Design a protein around this nucleic acid. Structure first.
Ligand SMILES: [Zn+2]
Ligand SMILES: [Zn+2]
Ligand SMILES: [Zn+2]
Ligand SMILES: [Zn+2]
Ligand SMILES: [Zn+2]
Ligand SMILES: [Zn+2]
Ligand SMILES: [Zn+2]
Ligand SMILES: [Zn+2]
Ligand SMILES: [Zn+2]
Length: 277
DNA sequence: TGTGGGCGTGGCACAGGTAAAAAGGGCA
DNA sequence: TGCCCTTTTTACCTGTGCCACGCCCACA
């Protein structure tokens, strides 16, 4: 009769609790083959796995990840402790990492600024500025051995290989459906429970999703690009303008086999194909 | 009294981008 | 091997195709 270490949802029989934690297990698909510890990404698993292969590492006993010098471990552990030992001498704002404090200092006089020459961004050091400047140059050095498309980092390349693998590693334990990212499995689990944390300030409707709410609010804020170059009609989706520009040309891409009838959009040829069902 | 389709938008599983967190590593 | 900048990995954001609604209307 505890609260879960993940959600905090108060399940109040000892067996109604362990029945509850069964539902979380698909969230962490990468399992260590020597202790069984599970992680949400292969990269995190490698940080833990060092403990079975490198004698010279320092392991976090709270999550199982290990590092190659004690100071790396002490710095990681502030994720668990909440300690923020880097405080701004000018304004007293405390941060967890020196890297964060270095960027905050840009908001006071006399920090060394590393300013970009194509936008107004400024960074705290040379390496960050070179990183950002790649967005201007378009450079994308890690190329999909398959797609041929470029990405700014190897993690991005790997992430994009879902496209070339269809693998769906994160499992709902209610439905059995898998997902490519824990974030999407997360949203799916909120769909089950109706947990809709993203409430619209104008209508009041709530959404499971950050993306779903943002699209919905595009009606109060009349934010509509892709205007018609022929009749000026302005739309919300890039796919609206494809539907309506097919009304000018009179094009009817989707037609029924049975009916022989023709529609400008597919959501009807699915709707009408339901007559013969 | 009914059918059924345009239609503007909701639900969903998703890609690929930048902003940021977090782990790495050169100097000494 | 810690300081502190670098480099990698993740969180946050924006925009998407496909399907499904449920409202509005000409017109069986
Ligand atoms: Zn839980
Ligand atoms: Zn292990
Ligand atoms: Zn830890
Ligand atoms: Zn710039
Ligand atoms: Zn590719
Ligand atoms: Zn499910
Ligand atoms: Zn609204
Ligand atoms: Zn038009
Ligand atoms: Zn038909």
């Amino acid at each position: 009769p505890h609260k879960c270490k993940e959600c905090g949802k108060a399940f109040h029989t000892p067996s109604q609790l362990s029945h509850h934690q069964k539902l979380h297990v698909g969230e962490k698909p990468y399992k260590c083959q020597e202790c069984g510890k599970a992680f949400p990404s292969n990269a995190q698993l490698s940080l833990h796995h060092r403990v079975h292969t490198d004698e010279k590492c320092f392991e976090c006993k709270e999550c199982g990840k290990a590092f190659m010098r004690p100071s790396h471990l002490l710095r990681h552990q502030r994720i668990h402790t909440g300690e923020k030992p880097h405080k701004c001498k000018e304004c007293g704002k405390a941060f967890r990492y020196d890297t964060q404090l270095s960027l905050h200092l840009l908001t006071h006089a006399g920090a060394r600024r590393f300013e970009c020459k194509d936008c107004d961004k400024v960074y705290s050091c040379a390496s960050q500025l070179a990183l950002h400047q790649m967005s201007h140059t378009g450079e994308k050095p890690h190329k999909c051995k398959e797609c041929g498309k470029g990405f700014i980092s190897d993690s991005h390349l790997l992430r994009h290989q879902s496209v070339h693998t269809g693998e769906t590693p994160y499992k709902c334990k209610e439905c059995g459906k898998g997902f490519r990212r824990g974030s999407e499995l997360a949203r799916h689990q909120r769909a089950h429970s109706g947990d809709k944390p993203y409430k619209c300030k104008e209508c009041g409707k709530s959404f499971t999703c950050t993306t779903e709410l943002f699209r919905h609010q595009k009606v109060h804020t009349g934010d509509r690009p892709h205007k018609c170059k022929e009749c000026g009609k302005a739309f919300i989706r890039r796919s609206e303008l494809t539907h309506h520009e097919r009304s000018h040309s009179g094009e009817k891409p989707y037609e029924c086999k049975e009916c022989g009838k023709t529609f400008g959009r597919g959501s009807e040829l699915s709707r009408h194909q339901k007559i013969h069902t």
